């Protein structure tokens, strides 16, 4: 198939591309020694889909004129192979001269022309962080269609990143909210001892304090069954969440972590609780395997929502089998791209991608720089100011105040570069034999719930208060992983509460008595 | 001046000489960000004078590289900003064009090793370019962690212990004085939370309960603050005084400190122990004002003191000059003088490795070395090879890429015409212990330790019962009489007298009765 000959087309203007399009295999990781080029000859799937939605979306932008008429929007796409070294062997050729293969070190670049005019960005926040840093200097702007870390909307050290995807933040927001919202003000929390979790807990832990929610107790949970060192510590915490009171309890993990610690449960008869689930756990399908999950409790969780493309299946195989014909060649990147047949590739892989908003958030990002050069050029509705050859600082100021449109779904850029997106809020049914993911609200900077939807196992709300609180005669006994909650204690017979700003009763002298609760003493 | 010398080979250089720290990191105008105007950094001119000195002595030296000019050229980093820049310089060809070849086997940059930054995030932006050519790099004060992990970081070295060893010479200090009750403060930036997490996972383990930590705000000294930011100053003081805990841990950046000290002493606060980080445990420019005598004790890990002979007398292309460093070092050189080399020797240690990998690899003879095109690649492989006395001190890197130089505790000291900051005890890391502790003069009333504990000993016969999360935090409460404190077996909970046996109030055994 020509497939990696197509991914490189002339244009007015150019936008690079570092997509998950190949990686290496583990012979590769070794420390190295010579500068010699990365193997990256091992093939994925899930790049070459992303990449094709760019060229789709890059299609219709030049198809229609209601984008940039009467000039051409051009690409060519690298694979950052999962690996730093050829992520960063890729950035620095995007910042090459025109019509060159080097990078210039001046002192001041007020007429450099760098070969390329936006980079839709890495998949990951590790090389979103270490591309971030090099893009931003010569105010290149990069436009990330997946790293949803909280770090890169630092505007002062990341002053050209965006994304066309929430932060992990909004995600915790809505969690926060939804906490807030039914009094479940004394929680725990669980993360997987990986980075996800542990800056997962990091947030939350964060974001409960500043509004007011106190944190019963904060763990950790292995996302394997191998080792000694993780079996001790998932039945620990299940211990200890237990002795705690709680009822509430918050996870930041992928599935594996969360079930393999309810299958210990299930096998000794732990007790139910509320849970609150991050989607990489709310995906059902291998966590309903568990043949008594009824004994968990109820589960709740939020999940991104997005007007997904309606015909980019029809176009991937349409361009596929034009790829097959030998004579398309009238019309390295990846060592493989060219040999993966199109049965392998058919309709099944991406209908298994739950990842289809990454696709329309590859497709989005396209947009947004388009609309930011139509914008940048004062383009007309048939005419553009094309006197002068724009230059990616310039597109950079015009990018923080833009609103821009895909398909249905229509977005703008914040002050920190994110977009502004909703989430479904939804309950985990088991009663059914099939189970399902049921719909119950909507979180859009609100949380819109729709009461008369949701279930209880004992058609009661759960309710999971701690006395923030206590009586004149009451002791405020602190707890909580952090100060903030106390349990109240009645003052015993015989001593004295004082005021209620004071925090210990003090006995009676010989003379004078007091009943229980009381602030002084009796004669 | 200073900032260039010819050679037959080149080092790179990238020393902090000015600093702000909320700097620009993008291009200013379309023009590389100015280093001119960000102040001054006196610590930085002494570790550049630390590298050319010891060019000078490789130079001078008719042993070590016979016949070879080992030159340098050197640019100054303002802490997080003008990255990236000085990067591109070193790699580039003469003209100062980088080519983007496929493969770099056969490349030859302007420099052959770079002496790196002195800071973890300047480190990790400038060895993710680095690492594209495996050309070598030597930093000499970037303690995290993260930049052991040789896969990611293959090219770099350090002459300086990690941040595990720093923290655990900081637990074992408090074990030895047994401080069970501690403050940490730590800045808004990854070196202080970094650094806070890692003390958090050591504290708990060893028994010592952390009563809270605190953030503070990354102020600039030379900028007068708002009204706000000094709401947030006088919280913070006033969290410290409300609190039984007198032992404070620092964590910061040395330029945000400037300005929570002066508060400190409006505040008219006194009595405590602060423990310093190696990012202020020395410093010239906080250590005069004087009055910070009056607020306590002031301890710091830092490296060990290593005296470099000759170096104090020898102190007497954008980005290459300093105006003020001249006249702003003449003001503390007499402070400086006093005060034996410490990170100077990381600096010179480094720029000695680097010169002895050069000679190694050149094939070298005592006669004369054969000189040849050196692919910085290689250097790099003989770099991680070397071994050999410097003074009186084997260099050499572990498998990890670091050099087991001492830590050390300095005590901070006012008394002028003697050391700054006097050495109180030693600690040494491939034996993780720390030893050789001296004489520390305390501000207490009549110099006895002073003490930070969440609770007292409870009394014989009487058990603990936690209170809060903190295990240090406990009351004590007698086993009535029948029950006694059997105290080798468990110190939470009593025990029965047997059925002839009976026991007093507030006691751990039982008596037989009538």
Redesign the interface.
Known sequence: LCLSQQFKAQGDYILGGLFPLGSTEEATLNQRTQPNSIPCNRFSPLGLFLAMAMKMAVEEINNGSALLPGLRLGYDLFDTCSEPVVTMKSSLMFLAKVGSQSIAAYCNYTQYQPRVLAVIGPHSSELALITGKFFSFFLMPQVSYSASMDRLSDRETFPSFFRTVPSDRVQLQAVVTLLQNFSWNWVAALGSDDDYGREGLSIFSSLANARGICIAHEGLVPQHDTSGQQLGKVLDVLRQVNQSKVQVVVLFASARAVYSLFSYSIHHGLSPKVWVASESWLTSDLVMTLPNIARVGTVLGFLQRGALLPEFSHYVETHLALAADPAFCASQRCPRCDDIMLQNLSSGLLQNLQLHHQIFATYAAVYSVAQALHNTLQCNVSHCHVSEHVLPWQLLENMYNMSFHARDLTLQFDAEGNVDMEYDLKMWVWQSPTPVLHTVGTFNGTLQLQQSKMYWPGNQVPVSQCSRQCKDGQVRRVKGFHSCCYDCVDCKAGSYRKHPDDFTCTPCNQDQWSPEKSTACLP | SDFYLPGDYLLGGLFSLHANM?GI???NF???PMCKEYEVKVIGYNLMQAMRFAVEEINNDSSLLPGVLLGYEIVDVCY?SN???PV??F??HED??????????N?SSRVVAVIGPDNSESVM?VA??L????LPQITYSAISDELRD???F?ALLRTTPSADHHIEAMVQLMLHFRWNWIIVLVSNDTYGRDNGQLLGERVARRGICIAFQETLPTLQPNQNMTSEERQRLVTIVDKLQQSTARVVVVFSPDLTLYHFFNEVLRQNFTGAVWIASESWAIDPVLHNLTELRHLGTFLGITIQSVPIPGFSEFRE??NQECDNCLNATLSFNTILRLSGERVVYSVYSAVYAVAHALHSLLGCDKSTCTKRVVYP?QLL?EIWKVNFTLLDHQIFFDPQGDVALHLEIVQWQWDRSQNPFQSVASYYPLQRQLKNIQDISWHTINNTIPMSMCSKRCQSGQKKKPV??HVCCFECIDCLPGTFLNHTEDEYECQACPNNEWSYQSETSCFKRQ
């Open positions: 909320k990191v993008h291009l379309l023009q590389v997080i990255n990236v820049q591109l310089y790699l580039a100062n064009l980088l080519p983007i070849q496929e493969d770099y086997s490349y932006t993710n370019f690492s594209l050519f495996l040789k896969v990611r293959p292309t954008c690649w492989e809060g999360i």
